[PDB]
Amino acid sequence: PIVQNLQGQMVHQAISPRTLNAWVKVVEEKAFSPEVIPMFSALSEGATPQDLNTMLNTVGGHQAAMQMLKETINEEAAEWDRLHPVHAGPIEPGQMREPRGSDIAGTTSTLQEQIGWMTHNPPIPVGEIYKRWIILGLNKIVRMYSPTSILDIRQGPKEPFRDYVDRFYKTLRAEQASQEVKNWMTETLLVQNANPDCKTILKALGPAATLEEMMTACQGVGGPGHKARVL
Amino acid sequence: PIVQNLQGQMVHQAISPRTLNAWVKVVEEKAFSPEVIPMFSALSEGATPQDLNTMLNTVGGHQAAMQMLKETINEEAAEWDRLHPVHAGPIEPGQMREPRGSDIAGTTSTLQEQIGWMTHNPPIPVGEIYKRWIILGLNKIVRMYSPTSILDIRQGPKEPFRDYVDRFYKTLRAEQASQEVKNWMTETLLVQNANPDCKTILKALGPAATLEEMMTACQGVGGPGHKARVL
Amino acid sequence: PIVQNLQGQMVHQAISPRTLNAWVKVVEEKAFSPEVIPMFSALSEGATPQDLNTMLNTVGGHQAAMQMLKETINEEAAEWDRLHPVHAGPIEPGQMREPRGSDIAGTTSTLQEQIGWMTHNPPIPVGEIYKRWIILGLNKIVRMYSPTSILDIRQGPKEPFRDYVDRFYKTLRAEQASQEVKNWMTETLLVQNANPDCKTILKALGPAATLEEMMTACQGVGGPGHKARVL
Amino acid sequence: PIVQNLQGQMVHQAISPRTLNAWVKVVEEKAFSPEVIPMFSALSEGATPQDLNTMLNTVGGHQAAMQMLKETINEEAAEWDRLHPVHAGPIEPGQMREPRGSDIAGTTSTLQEQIGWMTHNPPIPVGEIYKRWIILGLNKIVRMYSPTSILDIRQGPKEPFRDYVDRFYKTLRAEQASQEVKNWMTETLLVQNANPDCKTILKALGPAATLEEMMTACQGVGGPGHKARVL
Amino acid sequence: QGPKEPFRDYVDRFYKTLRAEQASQEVKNWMTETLLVQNANPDCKTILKALGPAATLEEMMTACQGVGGPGHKARVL
């Protein structure tokens, strides 16, 4: 990995054992689940295509999701080279070459190039590109391997609105659509699947109460009622 | 996180995986109890808005406190822009831009900018403002889940007053009541509620009563804690 | 191992129990399975021959596979000294210490002479070179595997289709047959992990179909779960 | 231990009490075994005779065998003195005194001499020389349970032979045996212990047996008609 | 191979089936050294595993003649 680009003065660091231990043991205990993705970005800080390939290729299992992941990075790679026209005549010898789709993927490109790119003035975002591409991969996985659809998450007859709300946001993390969609669901879908004892009172709150109004609601019906949360 | 340098101004380096694990350790062990803030703070020491963001995105449980905390930091950002004028007029050639409320959260600002504020003399305190905003969220969420009011907080009839301070202190520390309301509860409601043997000594020594003398008292009223505490 | 591997101003650090405890947890969990080679290359980053031998002496199981590892190291050393021949009597410009195979293996070399190669300009990177022989040996362990069929494919009401494809991928990434065969097996048997109706649907998508298209598909006629109401 | 100085000849760093404890926890709390040896080698990076001694004397477990190693290092010292006759009284002006066996063991030598000879040119590596004696002594402690040879290795009647091979090459690694005895063993004693229908492959392999040939041997060797060459 | 069918009749069909597949030579070679003798009659596994099932095509059709039917029928192409 290479860090210190912001204000210049970058340092190359070798691949760390303890990053590939952290990476393996999270994905093993939790699976490719929504809580991997900012952890994967954090572990991937300043990583080369080769630093990225080392991590990716030490995953072990889950070869359905990895092979789905691999296919997706290959689409983006094949996309890339056809949205970048090939250079007109000779490329000057002092000029640094452009990265291709297979170089971003680390398939045709060696570590010595990658460092040169990342220590160039200003730096080539080759790694940012491989990580967004991996992240489309991870994102697609979490769609395919869904725990349950957000659409059909409903409160029970005698399940409480706070217990429901824990499930609601837990599952809403699992859903992969855009933020207008997920602002919708808190606005709308939260109420329409809520249980009938609670739902009369949620249309008294209407579709732009404060989160504290939603939190204060619904202790007089559902679960062990008013005492449950204060005793 | 930004770290101390001898060769110039402080240099930015990546998050440790041991720090992200220590974070998830402390959240697991303490459950957003108000002892979190010392450990939030100590992990938050050199921390960028990108680091603080990362702390906020790696929390997997705690759905409601997490949403409520998000509502608080976004509200501080929107107050901050109303609070500070935009200034429409030109800035000197190569001058660093003024930090907006969104810039403090790192939604309009990138880590190259963030280190650039950081490495002025004295710093513009962009993550120290952000971290204070978060700290108010944690405290409101402590108070949010407090089980009975300070002005409602009582000892059982079969209690030797021994442990009435545990309950009394942590629901006063949530509420943040006045020393004068505390004196009024202590002269009125406290004496009225307090165990017989303790209540003689609390009337005798007024509302500023010696804490130890109650605690020494109450050896023969029976039940849970009447035998002495030991180290 | 050494700080700033082939980069100047180079500083030896001792072999850490963190790096050997991770080398232990890998062999215990998953032995010599192919996905350790990136972990093993990260472990071997900056490593001297002496560090590599300490890594090998730690393995106390699998001795027959380890003697083969060892034999293969002895064969590779022997090739290195037949491709680069060993000298008889004093060296003509005087002894500069050119790494022979036995020196590569840490047998007839000092730690100064190993480092010396890393601090010489152009360098001779002996560790990368010894590492390649060890990776040849660990790949050759996987070819001593107990018989596992790549034509015997399964697909019945026991695992999901994803999970059959996950089996199939493990089988191919453990199988060290030809890359043209391994693609061939993949084009021939990808669909053959589903039930008869799922296969009819799978083939109806076409010969450009990918695993994300297949794993949304089989609408109502698929494997265990993931097909909604059944027809 | 002794480490690189940046402005002159090596300097001493102070021995790790944290790893010195995790050392002793694998001497005292379990039975001797081959992975004890590299855990001592890893500890011993740059270790002086005085540090080697500490590694012995903070050990309190297994005093018989510790003593047997102590006694070995005495033999090695009295041996070193019969191979390297150092004269009586004071060394010459202008050159470094030569170490005796007592100077290797730290009995007669001081820290300054110990970091002296190690940094000298020609170097006497006193601390590497002393460690190798201890590596032999430990290697005897693991063979002091059981001097197991090829007569004690047995292939149970229904045993798939695989374990026999593993223990056979463990046996030859652990204490080096003669080439002639091994040609006798791969041509007679192994064939006699092998399963009846497997005896033709292993008898054909005979006194020329090779690890790759042995590691794949015995796959589908039963059934109608004889087989005799390993595929 | 048919249960009383000749080993050369099977192998004539097999190389016929290899001819018509558009596959690589390496693919054909994995089938020749991992499929060919495996899909044969067991009485032919007796002597053509004993050669080793990945050995030359000459000694394949030299061996194994007493297994099955009489063999030698000219093809009508």
Which alpha helices (DSSP H) does D29-100 contain, by range? 36-43, 49-57, 63-83
What does DSSP assign to residue E42? H
Report the distance separating Cα C24 and Cα C43, nearest Å. 11
What does DSSP assign to residue B186? I
Local structure of A22: helix, strand or coil: helix
Q: Which of C230, C231, C201 is nearest to C213 (CA)?
A: C201
Q: Long-range contact list for B143-150, CB < 8 A, 24+ apart?
A: B143/B174, B143/B175, B143/B176, B144/A215, B144/B65, B144/B68, B145/A229, B146/B170, B146/B171, B146/B174, B146/B175, B147/A229, B147/A230, B147/A231, B147/B171, B148/A230, B149/B175, B150/B174, B150/B175, B150/B177, B150/B185
Report the distance separating Cα E50 and Cα C225, nearest Å. 47
Report the distance separating Cα D175 and Cα D35, nearest Å. 16
**Are the Cβ atoms of C35 and A57 closer than 8 angstroms?**
yes
Which alpha helices (DSSP H) does A83-193 contain, by range? 101-104, 111-118, 126-144, 161-172, 179-187, 189-192
Q: Position of tokens 């609408």?
A: C219
Report the distance separating Cα A118 and Cα A182, nearest Å. 36
Q: How was this structure determined?
A: cryo-EM
Helix, strand, coil in percent for chain C, rounding step 5:
55, 0, 45
Strands D2-3 and C2-3, how do they pair? unpaired
Residue type, A189: L
Q: Long-range contact list for C86-95, CB < 8 A, 24+ apart?
A: none
- Cα B175 to Cα B35, B120, B169, B186: the distances in Å are 16, 39, 10, 16
Report the distance separating Cα C1 and Cα C49, nearest Å. 9
Give the tokens for residue D33. Answer: 């075994």
Report the distance separating Cα D172 and Cα D153, nearest Å. 12
**Are the Cβ atoms of A15 and C41 closer than 8 angstroms?**
yes
Question: Mind spelling out the 3-state secondary structure of D180-201?
Answer: HHHHHHHHHHHHHHCCCCCHHH
List chain E gaps (C–N > 2.5 A) by preceding residue: none
* Partner chains of E (3+ C-beta pairs under 8 Å): C, D
Give the tokens for residue C101. Answer: 């195979």
Measured between CA atoms, the residue of chain E closest to residue C150 is: E34
Contacts of C170 (CB under 8 A, 6+ apart): A61, A63
Chain E residues touching residue C181 (CB < 8 angstroms): 26-27, 30
Q: Which of C103, C217, C88, C82 is nearest to C162 (CA)?
A: C217
Measured between CA atoms, the residue of chain D closest to residue E50 is: D227
Q: What is the least distance, in Å, from the CA of E34 to any CA of chain C? A: 10
Contact E71, E65 (CB under 8 A): yes
Helix, strand, coil in percent for chain E, rounding step 5:
50, 0, 50
Give the tokens for residue A18. Answer: 């303890």
Residue type, C15: I
Give which of B3, B6, B11, B143 to mutate to test A binding, by max A Cβ within 10 Å. B11
Report the distance separating Cα C149 and Cα D196, nearest Å. 26
What does DSSP assign to residue B188? I
**Chain D residues in contact with chain E using a Cβ-Cβ cutoff of 8 Å:** 220, 223-229, 231
For CA atoms D193, D194, D195, D199, the dihedral sign is negative
Q: What is the least distance, in Å, from the CA of C180 to any CA of chain E? A: 7
Report the distance separating Cα B77 and Cα B83, nearest Å. 10
Contact C133, C126 (CB under 8 A): no
Report the distance separating Cα C210 and Cα A63, nearest Å. 14
Which alpha helices (DSSP H) does B106-210 contain, by range? 111-118, 126-144, 164-175, 179-185, 191-193, 196-204
List chain B gaps (C–N > 2.5 A) by preceding residue: none
Report the distance separating Cα C77 and Cα C100, nearest Å. 8
Chain D residues touching residue E52 (CB < 8 angstroms): 227, 229, 231
Report the distance separating Cα C47 and Cα C39, nearest Å. 13
Q: Calculate ∠ Cα D93-D94-D99, nearest 5°.
A: 85
Burial class (CB in 10 A: 0-12, 13-18, 19+), A92: exposed
Measured between CA atoms, the residue of chain B closest to residue A16 is: B17
Residue type, C64: A
Give the tokens for residue C168. Answer: 């199939």
**Are the Cβ atoms of A6 and B112 closer than 8 angstroms?**
yes
Strands B2-3 and B11-12, how do they pair? antiparallel
Local structure of A77: helix, strand or coil: helix
Q: Which of D144, D140, D141, D130 is nearest to D76 (CA)?
A: D130
- The shortest CB-CB distance from C169 to any of A16, A67, A145 is to A67
**Are the Cβ atoms of A229 and B14 closer than 8 angstroms?**
no
Give the tokens for residue C195. Answer: 């039930």
Give the tokens for residue E22. Answer: 């558009």
Contacts of C86 (CB under 8 A, 6+ apart): C100
Backbone angles phi, psi at C143, to 5 degrees: -80, -10
Backbone angles phi, psi at B158, to 5 degrees: -95, 10
What does DSSP assign to residue A43? H
Residue D93 region, left (φ>0) first, then alpha (ψ -120 to 50), else beta?
A: beta
Residue B3 pairs in a beta bridge with: B11
Exposure string over D198-230, b if 16+ CB within 10 A, otherwise e:
bbbbbebbeeebebeebbebbeebeeeeebeeb
Exposure string over D152-189, b if 16+ CB within 10 A, otherwise e:
ebebeeeeebeebbbbbbbbbebeeeeeeebeebbbeb
Burial class (CB in 10 A: 0-12, 13-18, 19+), A163: middle
Contact D10, D119 (CB under 8 A): yes
**Chain B residues in contact with chain A using a Cβ-Cβ cutoff of 8 Å:** 9, 11-15, 17-18, 20-21, 54, 57-58, 60, 63-64, 66-68, 71, 111-112, 114-116, 119, 144-145, 147-148
Contact B116, A6 (CB under 8 A): yes
Report the distance separating Cα C182 and Cα C187, nearest Å. 9
Asked if omega into C122 is within 30° of 0 (cis), the reply is yes
**Are the Cβ atoms of E52 and D224 closer than 8 angstroms?**
no
Residue C220 region, left (φ>0) first, then alpha (ψ -120 to 50), else beta?
A: left
Contacts of D227 (CB under 8 A, 6+ apart): D200, D201, D220, D221, E49, E50, E52
Report the distance separating Cα C64 and Cα D204, nearest Å. 20
Number of neighbouring beta carbons within 10 Å of residue B188 = 11
Local structure of A4: helix, strand or coil: coil
**Chain E residues in contact with chain C using a Cβ-Cβ cutoff of 8 Å:** 23-24, 26-27, 29-30
Residue type, A74: N
Residue C2 pairs in a beta bridge with: C12
**Are the Cβ atoms of E27 and C184 closer than 8 angstroms?**
yes
Chain C residues touching residue D39 (CB < 8 angstroms): 17, 20
Give the tokens for residue A147. Answer: 């725990």
Chain B residues touching residue A1 (CB < 8 angstroms): 14
**Are the Cβ atoms of A162 and B64 closer than 8 angstroms?**
yes
Report the distance separating Cα E27 and Cα E39, nearest Å. 16
What Rg value do the Cα atoms of chain D yield, rounded? 25
Report the distance separating Cα B201 and Cα B217, nearest Å. 8
Residue D11 pairs in a beta bridge with: D3
E strands present in C76-181: none
- Cα B229 to Cα B95, B190, B219, C172, D58: the distances in Å are 63, 23, 11, 67, 41
Report the distance separating Cα B111 and Cα B48, nearest Å. 8
Report the distance separating Cα A137 and Cα A36, nearest Å. 12
What is the four-CA torsion angle of A205, A211, A215, A218, rounded to 10 degrees? 20
Q: Position of tokens 């056809």?
A: A82
* Partner chains of C (3+ C-beta pairs under 8 Å): A, D, E
Report the distance separating Cα C45 and Cα D39, nearest Å. 20
Contact B32, B65 (CB under 8 A): yes
Report the distance separating Cα E10 and Cα E1, nearest Å. 5
Report the distance separating Cα B51 and Cα C179, nearest Å. 44
Q: Which of B138, B148, B187 is nearest to B168 (CA)?
A: B148
Contact B185, B205 (CB under 8 A): no
Give which of C16, C35, C51, C55 to mutate to test A binding, by max A Cβ within 10 Å. C35
Report the distance separating Cα B102 and Cα B79, nearest Å. 10
